[PDB]
Amino acid sequence: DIILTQSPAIMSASLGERVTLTCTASSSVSSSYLHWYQQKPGSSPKLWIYSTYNLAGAVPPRFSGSGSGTSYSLTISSMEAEDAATYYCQQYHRSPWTFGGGTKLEIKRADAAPTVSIFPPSSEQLTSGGASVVCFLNNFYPKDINVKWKIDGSERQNGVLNSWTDQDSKDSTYSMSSTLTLTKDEYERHNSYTCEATHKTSTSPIVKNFNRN
Amino acid sequence: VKLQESGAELVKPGASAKAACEASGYTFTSYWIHWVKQRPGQGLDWIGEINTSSGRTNYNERFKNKATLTVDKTSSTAYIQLSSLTSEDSAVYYCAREGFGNQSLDYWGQGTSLTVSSAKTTPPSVYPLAPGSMVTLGCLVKGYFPEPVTVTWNSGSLSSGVHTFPAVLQSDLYTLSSSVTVPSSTWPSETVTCSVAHPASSTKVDKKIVP
């Protein structure tokens, strides 16, 4: 019951930029018992810093940490691509031992609009009484995006499942998939299907449509 | 050095599991072992600690009655036993060594991916996503269990410009899609084939996208 707060939860930086992550504790922790871990997707966390300042086995010296009481940080002097990852603080001052919720550090790159594509239900799928409409929003930055489905001009929220890729390690864009699942009878009661993507690179939505027949 | 835990474990809801973590390359009794839970997409949550010499435990209250930790010092292996399983217990379970640095966790295992579902193996339906200078095509891979599937395009000779999205649990079954962008003078003249493998049901499915 010592809460570790990592604000902000998500951070962007360019390569070369100085970066600072903060860990804040609800009650004083003794600097000896404060730690940091790095995690990349699909890998285990790794010790990065222990007892506030001590770099761990293999941690390059561009990294430093400091703090005391309720105020801790981890600094990266000059960002490198390798340093994109999620970092957790952790305390051993009183039990139960806890981590903060982590700061995901991603790379800043130039803004980009999603390439949008809509696909009607295939005939194979309709022979099972299912009907999925798919919208791809590909290769965009920054990650924040809104996707709205319209059936004959009216918004639909029921039956929509999304999924996002991890920041692309080569070009630093993101992509998303949006899938609207209806029954076959449901799909055939209506004509117009639209996927509207809203994103900070335009004020008007990117709009993709088809009419079944 | 090392720490070996199984990569995946499938268990029915209501049941129990006993995941094993085998150390090597150090004097096992000199270090405590901690277990940490990581829910898909989420942060880290301490379960508890075990003194490996003596067998004494301390528990995150939250997991009292969910998790039991034990040791066998003769085989150098720590154990966690989760009871009364629900979808809420689906998570990666890491064993970690507590390490002389002021209780900091210096070595981790690769983690055990526990899935709590009633589902039976179920092979996927593969549906072509054909539109109605670049063109985007796709493949919807729906209604399979368990993970993973692998999706390639023309067996791997379409590698660039592919996005294959993470699976989502639609029902108690998984669904996922994959997109490929090619130059428009390539398709429909040259063939584009979604190749989908699901090992668990020993199934491969090849699906070509037709106009």
Numbering used by the authors:
A (entry chain B): 10 to 222
B (entry chain A): 2 to 133, 140 to 218
What text does the study give?
The envelope glycoprotein B (gB) is a major viral antigen known to play a crucial role in PRV entry. As the viral fusogen, gB is essential for both viral entry and cell-to-cell spread. In this work, we immunized mice with soluble PRV gB to generate gB specific mAbs and identified a total of 15 neutralizing antibodies that effectively block PRV entry with either complement dependent or independent mechanisms.
As the only complement-independent neutralizing antibody identified, the 1H1 mAb recognize PRV gB in regions different from all the other 14 mAbs. Interestingly, the 1H1 mAb displayed a broad-spectrum neutralizing activity against all PRV strains tested though with varied efficacies. To further characterize the antigen recognition properties of this mAb, we solved the crystal structure of 1H1 Fab at a resolution of 2.5 Å. In this structure, we observed an unusual N-linked glycosylation modification at residue N103 of the HCDR3 loop. To testify whether the glycans participate in antigen recognition of 1H1 mAb, we introduced site mutations to disrupt the “NXS” motif to eliminate the glycosylation modification. Compared with the wild type 1H1 mAb, the affinities of both the NL and SL mutants decreased almost 1000 times and the binding kinetics also displayed significant differences. The intact 1H1 mAb binds PRV gB with a quite slow kinetics but seems not to dissociate, while the two mutants are much faster in both binding and dissociation processes. These observations demonstrated that the glycans in the HCDR3 loop play a key but not indispensible role for antigen recognition of 1H1 mAb. According to the structure, the epitope of 1H1 was unambiguously mapped to the bottom of domain I in PRV gB. The binding of 1H1 Fab to PRV gB is likely mediated by the HCDR3, LCD1 and LCDR3 loops, among which the HCDR3 probably interacts with the 220-strand region and the LCDR1 and LCDR3 mainly recognize the 210-helix. Collectively, these observations implied that the main epitope of 1H1 neutralizing antibody is probably located in the 210-helix region of PRV gB, among which the residue R214 plays a critical role in the interactions.
